[PDB]
Amino acid sequence: MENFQKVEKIGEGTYGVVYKARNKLTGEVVALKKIRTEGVPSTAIREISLLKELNHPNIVKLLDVIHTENKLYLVFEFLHQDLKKFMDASALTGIPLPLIKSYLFQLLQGLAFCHSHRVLHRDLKPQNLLINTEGAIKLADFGLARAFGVPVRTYTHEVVTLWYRAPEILLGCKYYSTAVDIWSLGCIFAEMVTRRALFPGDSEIDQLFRIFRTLGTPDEVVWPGVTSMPDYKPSFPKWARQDFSKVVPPLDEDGRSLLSQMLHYDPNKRISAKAALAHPFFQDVTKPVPHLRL
Numbered sequence: 001m002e003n004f005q006k007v008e009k010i011g012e013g014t015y016g017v018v019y020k021a022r023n024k025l026t027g028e029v030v031a032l033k034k035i036r037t038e039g040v041p042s043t044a045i046r047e048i049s050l051l052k053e054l055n056h057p058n059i060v061k062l063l064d065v066i067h068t069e070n071k072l073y074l075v076f077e078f079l080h081q082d083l084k085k086f087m088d089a090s091a092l093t094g095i096p097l098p099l100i101k102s103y104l105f106q107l108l109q110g111l112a113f114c115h116s117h118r119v120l121h122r123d124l125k126p127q128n129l130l131i132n133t134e135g136a137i138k139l140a141d142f143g144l145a146r147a148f149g150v151p152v153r154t155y156t157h158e159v160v161t162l163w164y165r166a167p168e169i170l171l172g173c174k175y176y177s178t179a180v181d182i183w184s185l186g187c188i189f190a191e192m193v194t195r196r197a198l199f200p201g202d203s204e205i206d207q208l209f210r211i212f213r214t215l216g217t218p219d220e221v222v223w224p225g226v227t228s229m230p231d232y233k234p235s236f237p238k239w240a241r242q243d244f245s246k247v248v249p250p251l252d253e254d255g256r257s258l259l260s261q262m263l264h265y266d267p268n269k270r271i272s273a274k275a276a277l278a279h280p281f282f283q284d285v286t287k288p289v290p291h292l293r294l
């Protein structure tokens with residue numbers, strides 16, 4: 001790009017490609033996201049233009065928004081690594097619990113902030129959580145289903161991940177609440193702890209049944225109204241709920257208790273980011289620094 005000397009391609013999100021680039025003028029290194037078409041709507045440019053004011057230590061700062069030629073460019077502060085790479089890098093030893101706790105705590109602060117401002121992320125996943133050498137972790141991407149709406153893929157033939165999708169979404173609820181972000185964060189928390197995706201579905205139905213096999217097929221008792229959901233079918237198999245101690249060993253009881261609250265089927269029962277920050281699990285929370293290999 002004329003103003004940016006693209007360093008490299010560091011990703012290809014569900015909306016566009018992300019590049020590491022240097023402002024030929026300021027010399028600042030940033031993350032430049034190219035957005036995907038036939039004119040680029042204005043309702044979105046506003047939704048986006050609104051994000052620039054959403055500043056918090058646990059939210060990646062959106063520096064500039066540039067609309068030009070069917071392509072929208074989002075300029076973000078650059079962070080050196082994402083949680084997916086860090087988890088892969090920590091696979092053999094596991095991320096130390098104090099760091100897992102710090103990361104969870106910070107992301108909940110980020111979400112509490114977003115949610116208090118009625119902003120929903122909607123697509124939390126390891127690849128959308130960025131970390132630095134200082135021990136911070138920030139929410140990135142935020143998708144844009146409200147400012148657009150996930151079509152059929154990312155933008156150019158790429159398998160979207162369903163692993164962190166809340167059940168109400170999979171069951172066709174058209175109106176997501178902040179609860180979907182807590183569910184996703186719950187899934188990531190479990191994954192950091194066990195070093196294995198909690199619900200690695202490879203299709204919407206497989207994702208749904210993996211959740212059902214583990215947490216039990218929901219019914220009107222645990223989730224009032226579930227049998228009325230758009231994609232609910234009486235023919236869904238009926239699996240019993242598995243014991244939580246088998247789901248995330250060796251997470252301690254405080255952690256398991258918090259996780260169960262983040263994974264309640266009923267969105268209305270699911271814990272809020274604000275309430276989660278008060279959970280006993282965070283009593284001894286600290287801010288360790290990660291060992292990042294850049």
Ligand SMILES: Nc1nc(Nc2ccc(C(=O)O)cc2)sc1C(=O)c1cccnc1
Nearest residue numbers: 013018031076077078079080081082085140
């Ligand atoms: N600001 C920002 N910084 C990133 N850094 C890296 C990310 C990954 C790696 C890596 O895998 O080595 C290095 C730096 S990615 C990113 C984004 O704002 C973003 C993330 C995901 C989707 N869309 C935009």
